[PDB]
Amino acid sequence: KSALSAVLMNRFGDAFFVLGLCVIAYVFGTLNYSTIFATAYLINTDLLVLIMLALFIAAMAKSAQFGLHNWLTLAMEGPTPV
Amino acid sequence: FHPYNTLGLATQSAMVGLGAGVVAAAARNSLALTTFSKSGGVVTIFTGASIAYVFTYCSAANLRERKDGWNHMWAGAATGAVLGARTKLVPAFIGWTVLCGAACGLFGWTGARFNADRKASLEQSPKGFVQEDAHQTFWEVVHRRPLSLTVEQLGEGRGINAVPIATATEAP
Amino acid sequence: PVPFSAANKKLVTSMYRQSLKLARNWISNRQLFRQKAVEIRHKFDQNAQISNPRLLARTLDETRAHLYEFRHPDPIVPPSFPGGTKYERNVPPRMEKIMQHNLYEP
Amino acid sequence: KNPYKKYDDQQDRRNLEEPLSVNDDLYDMWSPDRFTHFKNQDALKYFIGF
Amino acid sequence: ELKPSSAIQRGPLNKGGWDAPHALHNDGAIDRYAHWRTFYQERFKYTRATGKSTLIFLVAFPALIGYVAYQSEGLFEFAGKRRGESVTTR
Amino acid sequence: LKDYYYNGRRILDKIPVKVTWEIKREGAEKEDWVNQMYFLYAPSLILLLIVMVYKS
Amino acid sequence: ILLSSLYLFNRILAWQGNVKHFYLFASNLLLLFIVVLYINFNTFSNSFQFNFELFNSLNPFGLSNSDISNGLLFGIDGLSLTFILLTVLLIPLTLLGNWYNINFNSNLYYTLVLAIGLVILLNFWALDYISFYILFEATLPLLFILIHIYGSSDSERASFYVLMFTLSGSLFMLLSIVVISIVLNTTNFINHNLFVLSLDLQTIIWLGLFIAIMVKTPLFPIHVWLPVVHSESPLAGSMILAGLILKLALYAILRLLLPLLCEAQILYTPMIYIISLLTIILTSLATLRQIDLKVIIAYSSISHMGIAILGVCSNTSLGIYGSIVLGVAHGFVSPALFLIVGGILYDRYHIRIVNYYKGLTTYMPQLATYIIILSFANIGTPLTGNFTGEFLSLQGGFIRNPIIGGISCISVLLAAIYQLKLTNKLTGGISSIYMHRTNDVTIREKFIMNILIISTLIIGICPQIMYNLLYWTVNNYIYII
Amino acid sequence: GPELTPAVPFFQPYVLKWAGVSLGLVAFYQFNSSYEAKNGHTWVE
Numbered sequence A: 001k002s003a004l005s006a007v008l009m010n011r012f013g014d015a016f017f018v019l020g021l022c023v024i025a026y027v028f029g030t031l032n033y034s035t036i037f038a039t040a041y042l043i044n045t046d047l048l049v050l051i052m053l054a055l056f057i058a059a060m061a062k063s064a065q066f067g068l069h070n071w072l073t074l075a076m077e078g079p080t081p082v
Numbered sequence B: 001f002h003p004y005n006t007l008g009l010a011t012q013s014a015m016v017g018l019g020a021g022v023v024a025a026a027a028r029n030s031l032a033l034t035t036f037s038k039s040g041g042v043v044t045i046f047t048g049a050s051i052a053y054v055f056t057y058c059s060a061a062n063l064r065e066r067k068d069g070w071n072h073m074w075a076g077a078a079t080g081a082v083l084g085a086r087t088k089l090v091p092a093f094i095g096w097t098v099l100c101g102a103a104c105g106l107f108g109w110t111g112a113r114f115n116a117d118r119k120a121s122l123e124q125s126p127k128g129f130v131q132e133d134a135h136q137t138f139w140e141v142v143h144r145r146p147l148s149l150t151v152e153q154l155g156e157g158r159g160i161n162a163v164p165i166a167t168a169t170e171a172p
Numbered sequence C: 001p002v003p004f005s006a007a008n009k010k011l012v013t014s015m016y017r018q019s020l021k022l023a024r025n026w027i028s029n030r031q032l033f034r035q036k037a038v039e040i041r042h043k044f045d046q047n048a049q050i051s052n053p054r055l056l057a058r059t060l061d062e063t064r065a066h067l068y069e070f071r072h073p074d075p076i077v078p079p080s081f082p083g084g085t086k087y088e089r090n091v092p093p094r095m096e097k098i099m100q101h102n103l104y105e106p
Numbered sequence D: 001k002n003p004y005k006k007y008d009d010q011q012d013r014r015n016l017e018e019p020l021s022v023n024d025d026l027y028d029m030w031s032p033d034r035f036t037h038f039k040n041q042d043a044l045k046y047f048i049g050f
Numbered sequence E: 001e002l003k004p005s006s007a008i009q010r011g012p013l014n015k016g017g018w019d020a021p022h023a024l025h026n027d028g029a030i031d032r033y034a035h036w037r038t039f040y041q042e043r044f045k046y047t048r049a050t051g052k053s054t055l056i057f058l059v060a061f062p063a064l065i066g067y068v069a070y071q072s073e074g075l076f077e078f079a080g081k082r083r084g085e086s087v088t089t090r
Numbered sequence F: 001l002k003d004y005y006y007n008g009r010r011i012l013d014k015i016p017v018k019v020t021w022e023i024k025r026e027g028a029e030k031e032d033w034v035n036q037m038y039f040l041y042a043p044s045l046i047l048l049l050i051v052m053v054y055k056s
Numbered sequence G: 001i002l003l004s005s006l007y008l009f010n011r012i013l014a015w016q017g018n019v020k021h022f023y024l025f026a027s028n029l030l031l032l033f034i035v036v037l038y039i040n041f042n043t044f045s046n047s048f049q050f051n052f053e054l055f056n057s058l059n060p061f062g063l064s065n066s067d068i069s070n071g072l073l074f075g076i077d078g079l080s081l082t083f084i085l086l087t088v089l090l091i092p093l094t095l096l097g098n099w100y101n102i103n104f105n106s107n108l109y110y111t112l113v114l115a116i117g118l119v120i121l122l123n124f125w126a127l128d129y130i131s132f133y134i135l136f137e138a139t140l141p142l143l144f145i146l147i148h149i150y151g152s153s154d155s156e157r158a159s160f161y162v163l164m165f166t167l168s169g170s171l172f173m174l175l176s177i178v179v180i181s182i183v184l185n186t187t188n189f190i191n192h193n194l195f196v197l198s199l200d201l202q203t204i205i206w207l208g209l210f211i212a213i214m215v216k217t218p219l220f221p222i223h224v225w226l227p228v229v230h231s232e233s234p235l236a237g238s239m240i241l242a243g244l245i246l247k248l249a250l251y252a253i254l255r256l257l258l259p260l261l262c263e264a265q266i267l268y269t270p271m272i273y274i275i276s277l278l279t280i281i282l283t284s285l286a287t288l289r290q291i292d293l294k295v296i297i298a299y300s301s302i303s304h305m306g307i308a309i310l311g312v313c314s315n316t317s318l319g320i321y322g323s324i325v326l327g328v329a330h331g332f333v334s335p336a337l338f339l340i341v342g343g344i345l346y347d348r349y350h351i352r353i354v355n356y357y358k359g360l361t362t363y364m365p366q367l368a369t370y371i372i373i374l375s376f377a378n379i380g381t382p383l384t385g386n387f388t389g390e391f392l393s394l395q396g397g398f399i400r401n402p403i404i405g406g407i408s409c410i411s412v413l414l415a416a417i418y419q420l421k422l423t424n425k426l427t428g429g430i431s432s433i434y435m436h437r438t439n440d441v442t443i444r445e446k447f448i449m450n451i452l453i454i455s456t457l458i459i460g461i462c463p464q465i466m467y468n469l470l471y472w473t474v475n476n477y478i479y480i481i
Numbered sequence H: 001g002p003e004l005t006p007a008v009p010f011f012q013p014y015v016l017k018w019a020g021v022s023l024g025l026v027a028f029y030q031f032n033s034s035y036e037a038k039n040g041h042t043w044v045e
């Protein structure tokens, strides 16, 4: 049950990450770091806010911020080295 | 669009429905003063269906100032409401309403006729490829349509533009 | 509601057990837990001889309310038991023979 | 269901031929965990208050 | 006097095959629960709750999505939009 | 013959070779589907992959 | 040849008594033949290549070289070639997955299975509306008979569903096809984008075509037949139905609808997006409260088809490529899951209720590994073709309509929920008390599942390997002025 | 010292099959690339 909780919450983060990937590909035409960082400063700020909100929701799930954190304390069901 | 006279047409429909219910009652009697006692309310069935359909149809047509299948959809909804009130159950009432409305809306969409409108039909219409620069009629086909017609019908955006992109973005 | 019966016995012994488990769960310090246990003992001792039905029923109800007021979010449970963290961990397999399901294929 | 009674399937705390509620899948062991300490409404009050 | 031909010899339909040992211990309660859930459509009735879920999911939700999808058609263009520029076309 | 072979092999856990019913189940077992599949279907998928890679 | 080969078939039947070896051999030959065709297929051309015509009046029983073409047309381009390769890959596995569990009228069963496979394969070759429709309906009698005779307990209702729902949609498809026939007097797919019908007529024809697509894909709200038909079908029926017959719908959109009714499609696209978002969200949620294994696997396919549709009507090259790749990956993965639930577990225990199953890892670790791999593949793990398809489809959908596509990105989560909720209970816990120990997955079952897994992995790590066949197609259907 | 379960050969049938196929495919790829470099077109083309 703890494993299911963790995988599902991180899949929530991943759904928002996929939303972010779609918008990045549409807006910049690519996923490479070099191009995105080369042409970031010229992009409309609403689009950047959309991208960054999606990616931040993903990282929030991953980094167990208070929105998506319950799995963090269920994960100690696994072995201590894990 | 000039109006239907809702009051008059509904009155004639009341008369027709009453007569039809009378005929159905006489038949019902013959097949089974008791004719109306053992009628099963068929006179009321006919009268109510007639008044509901005609009144709602004319009402809707006058209010929307249009003549199309939607008026028949409303009228079928009213007729189904009348016929499903006889069940005395809310689910059945709703089902009669929506389904009779849908069936009559389909009927009105196809032309509100059981036989065909011969002059509008494909067999009696200009068909095939059109000539030099003629306007497209319903059954005719071309090899290329005018871009202004596309922009007006479909609407601007979503890749629909007045000018092809490559032409518009050409440098000089 | 008997003043002294086997069912009364079982009920009050269970409640007294409970009270003690609650006290252990609530108090981290051992010495302090000891004084809480002895106070709980004295409090049960005092009301031991109640006889009339109304007063005994009221006292039992009130003590149930007290225990419910002082229930702990997470009781201490050893690892190998239902609430425990070892529970069902590496459950040894049931030793079994394979039943076949198909004449041609294992 | 207290876990010290014996059951035919101890992990699911079910005995054989026990009748199943129509909404059983919401009440078995695999169902989302329920917590008894605070009432649901009360826990909502605390969460929103914090 | 009307009887099938005596010429016909009828035997049993046997399906053959190897009767495997029965590897599942059927639980009657589970089977009844499964049958009830499987044929729930035969017993469905329109009530206040059931009608409420019907009118939500088959009517209200489609209407919401339709309003969104027809209101927003062609509204956005994002490819390479820069600062100060409108991401909206209308 | 099929029936006798497989019924014995299933209700004895013994193979009908070697001639009285030995237990030597390690090897000498070939199912009938394996020749066709392994020697035609698998090469065909390998060929498809090669062709796609080189048509790319 | 045909006379001699018929003699060979007859003799093999008389001596061996079970046709199934001959059918397996035949299907493998067909696969090899299609691969030879792929070798000789020119990819630097957007023209149909291996053309032939049947039932022409000058030569009713042969091929036609006449200057008047009144027969049925067949031929392939890259788009048809992709699905044909998928079909010939899947057919022998469909034969093999029932190699031992059919012990009665087995010859008839294998005949029906191979006939259905051949019908679908030929359907992909069709080049005009009438032959497409003919081969599109020809499966329904075979599916009806197969499901009725070789199905599980509730198979009669299943057979009636699979016939009736598909007929219901197909007849409205027939209305649209009849309108096209009488308006254009042509039916071919070769030059049907050259005819520009009036917008109103396009809007009317589109309705019949899309009603057929709703029933066959399926899409919400007329999807309720599929879970039944799947659960009571025998394994071959379920594998074929999930892996090919649904992709027939997507191929139908691309081939019949988009080139002819472009402007009407542009008008109707938001309605399509409403229906696809409905099917994704609502069927994914409804999957949570199912108690049958095969029913849950069936419900998964509908959601993946919803994502496919969102991709294919996106009016972008990426969306179409994603829809195709997702179709192929689904044709790899879903037959594998159906193999598990309806051929391994069902043939060992003859039950499909979820409550009975638990903790299968202890006795059958290999089956548990297969379940884990296939489930993470089904929910769209990268380096699997399913992920590429869902990602590209979602890109196209987000471009076509940012709000609707953004909301559709919830499919990743929803798919994870139902699939992992299933596999959690199946793999772990203490071994069930209701069932006893049985054999682990055998060599045949492992062979089939390995084929499907390696196929999906190969196209998941390098989805580009399909591009040589599809780079014309990704431009042949998008409508930008 | 931990206990010792029975011996098992390193190279199983599946090891042989999968390793042989994969290595043969890589060798075939390299052979085609080299045969391209010399003949000016790959042996498969």
Ligand SMILES: CCCCCCCCCCC(CCCCCCCCCC)(CO[C@H]1O[C@@H](CO)[C@H](O[C@@H]2O[C@@H](CO)[C@H](O)[C@@H](O)[C@@H]2O)[C@@H](O)[C@@H]1O)CO[C@H]1O[C@@H](CO)[C@H](O[C@@H]2O[C@@H](CO)[C@H](O)[C@@H](O)[C@@H]2O)[C@@H](O)[C@H]1O
Residues within 6 Å of the ligand: B067, B068, B069, B070, B108, B109, B110, B111, B112, B113, B117, B120, B121, B125, B136, B137, B138, B139, G172, G175, G179, G200, G201, G204, G207, G208
């Ligand atoms: C897959 C779902 C199936 C369900 C949908 C099918 C319903 C079809 C509706 C479409 C359609 C037939 C199209 C058939 C095409 C193939 C048939 C498809 C398969 C058949 C199953 C029926 O159109 C009907 O629509 C009804 C309203 O809903 C009207 O109802 C009635 O309204 C009131 C009376 O005036 C009354 O008050 C009452 O009698 C009803 O209220 C009918 O009068 C009307 O005929 C339209 O046909 C007609 O359209 C017009 C202009 O379009 C065409 O002429 C055009 O003239 C100029 C402008 O006029 C244009 O400049 C010119 O270019 C063009 O020449 C015609 O040539 C003709 O073709």
Ligand SMILES: CCCCCCCCCCCCCCCCCC(=O)OC[C@H](COP(=O)(O)OCCN)OC(=O)CCCCCCCCCCCCCCCCC
Residues within 6 Å of the ligand: G050, G051, G052, G054, G063, G115, G118, G119, G121, G122, G125, G134, G135, G138
């Ligand atoms: C019952 C449902 C309704 C039935 C409607 C239709 C029934 C049709 C019956 C099946 C017959 C079709 C298959 C054989 C026709 C093709 C024969 C042929 O020779 O191919 C012609 C084509 C061009 O050849 P050619 O111009 O002569 O040049 C040769 C150069 N060396 O050469 C080629 O390019 C090769 C073409 C390969 C075609 C692959 C076909 C895939 C499946 C083959 C068998 C399908 C049988 C279906 C049985 C179920 C019924 C659908």
